[PDB]
Amino acid sequence: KQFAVIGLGRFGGSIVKELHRMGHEVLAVDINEEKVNAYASYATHAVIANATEENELLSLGIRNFEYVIVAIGANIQASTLTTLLLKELDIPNIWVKAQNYYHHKVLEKIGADRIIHPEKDMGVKIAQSLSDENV
Amino acid sequence: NKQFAVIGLGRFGGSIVKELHRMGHEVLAVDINEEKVNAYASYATHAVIANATEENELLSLGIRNFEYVIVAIGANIQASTLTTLLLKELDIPNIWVKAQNYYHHKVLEKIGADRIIHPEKDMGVKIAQSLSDENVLNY
Amino acid sequence: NKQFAVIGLGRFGGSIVKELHRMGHEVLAVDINEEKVNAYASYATHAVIANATEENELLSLGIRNFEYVIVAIGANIQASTLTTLLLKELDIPNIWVKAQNYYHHKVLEKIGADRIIHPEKDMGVKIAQSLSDENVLNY
Amino acid sequence: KQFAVIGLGRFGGSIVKELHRMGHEVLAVDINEEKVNAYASYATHAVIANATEENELLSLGIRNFEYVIVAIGANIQASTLTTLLLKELDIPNIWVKAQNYYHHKVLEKIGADRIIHPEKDMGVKIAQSLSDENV
Amino acid sequence: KQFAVIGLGRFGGSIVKELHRMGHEVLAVDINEEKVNAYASYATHAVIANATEENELLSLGIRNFEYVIVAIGANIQASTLTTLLLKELDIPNIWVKAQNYYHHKVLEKIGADRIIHPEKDMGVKIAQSLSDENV
Amino acid sequence: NKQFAVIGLGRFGGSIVKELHRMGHEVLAVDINEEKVNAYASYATHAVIANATEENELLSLGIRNFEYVIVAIGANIQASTLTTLLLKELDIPNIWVKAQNYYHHKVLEKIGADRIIHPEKDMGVKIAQSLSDENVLNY
Amino acid sequence: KQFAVIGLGRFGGSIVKELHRMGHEVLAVDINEEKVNAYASYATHAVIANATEENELLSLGIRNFEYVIVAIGANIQASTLTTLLLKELDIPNIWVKAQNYYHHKVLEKIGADRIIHPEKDMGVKIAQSLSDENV
Amino acid sequence: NKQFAVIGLGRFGGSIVKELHRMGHEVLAVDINEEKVNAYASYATHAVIANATEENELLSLGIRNFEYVIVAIGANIQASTLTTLLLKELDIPNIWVKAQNYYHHKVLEKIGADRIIHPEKDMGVKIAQSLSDENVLNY
């Protein structure tokens, strides 16, 4: 039921807007206040927080969500520390955006339930979308 | 026969080439970098080394003959817009382009791109969709 | 009344503004840089500070009302193409743009520029013409 | 009668092509061989030379021309040394492309007969071209 | 008994030379051949390998060692993937050089037995060395 | 009283300051950056903001009065060598310096550094020692 | 009798201090106010001015000096425009610091009475100073 | 015989080599750049290509045998200080060095340079002297 998105970049921010459009409630979070404001109107709650800090993770209630998506970008360290922590809180489903090959490999062994690769995944989508031309 | 062609064998471009191959489709794969072209020899019917911004090289490829041509050039807005510009000249039925940002999208719309892809954002909506399906479709 | 507008008050843009003033024509002068706008206050009917790439700022200027609009933005192909892109949307009767190179020229042709200026090259032909006149016209 | 162009950049190169199209003979010169080749077909003679070197200027015969245009670009020093030398050879008309304000001022006091400013000059041309709309 | 050092930088390379001087046998490994050669004379065996690749880790016999030190530097991703893999092979003691705060935190939760911080640790050493002045 | 002074509150410098405090020793902590000086106010008897390369600022600090002065300046070989150069002038009984590389070490030896620290390498030998102790001392 | 120094860099500034030490009066000038202040105590008069501007050159009285040294540095254009102007005012002796080979060549043809090359000239000085070891 | 050696054949270094030759003195000219070494073959008894910062290369040159050695390395304070550091080790009777700035001067004083040259400033005093002579000596 619950949906929480950590990291409001193009990928993460986009999934927050879609959840909203599809009439779903979503907790949006990011360390950058500016980022949090840009999506405040699309989320039930938009909170400024460093997903690395366990104390901020608890005062956030993140442990109460069924699905938490980690969409941190360039900061690969924050990304794996964050999923490591969500895994300690036993979040049912934690999906993570993988920055690169090594990142996927660490995430796989860390406890991420689904690893997302925008570029590659969108690529197979377009290939299947190309075939559909004659379906 | 000569239905699909992909220019730019990066993560995105190369991925559409592999998937097409897996689905048993013929695919023309091109890049300016030879190391990229050699990495996709086992997936493309033909994998040629060429500069998509060169009008002559586009003829030596036969591109004017494909129904769909994907411009998957990355961090080079210039090479990307130039290329789709040359493709529209050869009146390609369908030219799809990976956009880098809002600026790039704006020029591609007017320059001839029939479809514009924004991997990050677009994948975001599909992830939202998968999440909704987990609960709504009761999956 | 509202016949000419020049966006980009560099050497080229500012020069067309001054000459127009000298010829007694009304001219709308714009730049994003205030120091540039203040340097042309004595030559333009109105000298406004604005970012030509912003759709809102283009309305707050009234640009949709001019017959000729010159995009004289320099070393910023992006700001330049974006701007002429917004101008064509507002259906400007005549939009003239200073091109930076071959690539820039190619996008401007398809994006809406009615005339494209290449200062260096273009001035070269006129200099050739002046040389021919020195001898041919016996001057 | 004679026309010689020193510096085959966009400005200089362009005036060589126009002279040719208008059926005129022109001596084209530049220090960069590649540049000289790009315009070899448009000039009666295209020669590789450093216009700074007096010896190369004489083995070039530059002193025999009525009009010599100095179209050196960024190398402002070469530009003023070159016009200084052409002035010593008493060339009838020496026209020079001015790089900036100080450059114009030195050229003016050095002996350049006409100082050309592409950007500014093309600017008044466009202003006059704009008026002509109702002429 | 067994000692294996992954990453032959200043830190890792230095521990290999000391083990040798103290008459100990040590397996030295690095992805850069040049690095491996610089320490070939100090180790019983010096092998070129990407510690990220499980296949290279096995053809290396790394699983047979009692102590394996991961001294990768700037490549923080390789560093945590490498310790993650050594942990899967159940190496008795795996000591890791921590690049920064987040890195220590991930390493701590990953299975590193000892986390080393050259700068900080050498710092307390000097403080204790300063006191000893009057001991 | 005025026994230890540490210039440069980076990872290395700040660490010696904290440990000294933990051991109950008085310590003079200095840095040019105020944010660094404020981060160590709870560990140093006195935490002053100063540029160790300035002869005047070194007098306003009283440095000539300490038995041991640690130059823990990092990625600034110049600020580092200059500083130890000024310290040797004031005839400091003991001046210890963190070296950045072989070049830096070579100049520090001749410029007056009584002891030169190479964190990475030096820590490497101690780690080797700990490993030997695990087996040799049967620990 | 009169001495004026234009450009208070290491070279120009140094000649102002020496003239002062040797009990001579000197007019010091530079476009940068900070520069002018750094030598205000060594000159009879220290004035802020752009030596390129003829109006500033006259309100300066520069034309009344017997020796004017142009010590502009990187701004080679200002340097040659400035000597060109001092030459129009017919200054008896104008000495100029040459930035490079082309610069010397233009200066030579412009009217500079003496061209100074710190690096090269100091070089022959040291060679002669080396010989003197056995003189 | 083996009286003078100059390391660094830039404007300054090369100039001392030429003048020495003109005065009929033997001179050992060295540089790391071959194009610089070839430009001074007609002025030096011996013009060798070597890296003055390498202890071995300094022995293969015989430098320990010269009374005067000039370090005329330019925009490389490191190569400059390192070199004079190695020269002082070989106990050179006289080592003269071109300084780049105040910082460089300060390290050279303590590292072994017997004389330090600051071209710009130093030439400034000589120019002042020439000016005084024009009037004072009534020249």
Ligand SMILES: Nc1ncnc2c1ncn2[C@@H]1O[C@H](COP(=O)(O)OP(=O)(O)OP(=O)(O)O)[C@@H](O)[C@H]1O
């Ligand atoms: N420790 C953290 N806790 C919470 N949010 C974080 C943390 N670290 C980074 N973020 C946020 O995650 C987001 C990272 O997405 P990112 O900025 O890398 O995408 P982008 O660069 O904006 O564009 P793209 O998606 O194409 O890479 C940023 O908005 C950033 O503020």
Ligand SMILES: Nc1ncnc2c1ncn2[C@@H]1O[C@H](COP(=O)(O)OP(=O)(O)OP(=O)(O)O)[C@@H](O)[C@H]1O
């Ligand atoms: N002018 C060109 N003609 C043909 N191919 C080109 C041209 N310019 C670039 N390419 C190729 O297109 C690809 C661009 O993708 P990119 O440079 O962003 O690498 P990538 O990051 O792995 O791809 P992606 O951004 O999808 O992850 C490269 O393989 C590059 O060699």
Ligand SMILES: Nc1ncnc2c1ncn2[C@@H]1O[C@H](COP(=O)(O)OP(=O)(O)OP(=O)(O)O)[C@@H](O)[C@H]1O
């Ligand atoms: N987005 C923009 N909107 C409006 N004006 C702009 C914008 N971007 C740049 N300009 C202005 O346009 C002018 C660009 O000309 P440029 O930057 O090349 O200086 P310039 O070299 O003197 O002009 P020129 O190239 O003709 O000699 C500048 O005055 C700049 O401030």
Ligand SMILES: Nc1ncnc2c1ncn2[C@@H]1O[C@H](COP(=O)(O)OP(=O)(O)OP(=O)(O)O)[C@@H](O)[C@H]1O
């Ligand atoms: N000393 C010289 N003698 C002869 N030719 C020279 C000399 N110095 C420079 N040139 C030539 O003059 C030309 C300078 O024009 P330039 O290259 O600056 O224009 P550009 O940079 O190509 O484009 P633009 O005209 O817009 O500045 C060059 O082709 C250069 O090789």
Ligand SMILES: Nc1ncnc2c1ncn2[C@@H]1O[C@H](COP(=O)(O)OP(=O)(O)OP(=O)(O)O)[C@@H](O)[C@H]1O
């Ligand atoms: N995946 C890997 N497998 C094996 N070795 C690796 C791997 N990745 C990096 N290394 C090696 O680990 C070492 C990293 O240490 P590093 O180079 O960062 O220290 P340094 O930069 O040389 O100096 P410092 O210790 O002060 O940082 C390198 O020699 C590198 O080749």
Ligand SMILES: Nc1ncnc2c1ncn2[C@@H]1O[C@H](COP(=O)(O)OP(=O)(O)OP(=O)(O)O)[C@@H](O)[C@H]1O
């Ligand atoms: N001239 C100076 N005088 C006094 N302090 C200085 C001076 N220059 C730099 N410092 C300080 O010395 C410290 C240098 O350490 P550094 O810049 O390498 O940061 P760091 O990496 O955290 O330290 P370390 O290299 O030990 O990890 C900084 O806190 C810096 O502000």
Ligand SMILES: Nc1ncnc2c1ncn2[C@@H]1O[C@H](COP(=O)(O)OP(=O)(O)OP(=O)(O)O)[C@@H](O)[C@H]1O
């Ligand atoms: N047009 C001008 N009129 C008056 N003074 C000028 C003018 N242009 C430059 N200057 C001054 O001339 C001086 C140039 O000397 P310069 O700064 O190049 O030497 P430096 O860079 O400080 O060190 P060095 O002498 O080794 O090059 C500067 O102080 C500058 O402010």
Ligand SMILES: Nc1ncnc2c1ncn2[C@@H]1O[C@H](COP(=O)(O)OP(=O)(O)OP(=O)(O)O)[C@@H](O)[C@H]1O
């Ligand atoms: N490590 C070295 N050993 C020997 N020679 C060196 C070394 N490093 C640099 N050099 C040489 O010393 C000279 C340095 O002078 P520089 O780089 O400043 O050129 P320059 O500007 O013409 O000399 P100057 O500053 O006197 O005008 C160069 O010829 C360079 O090749």
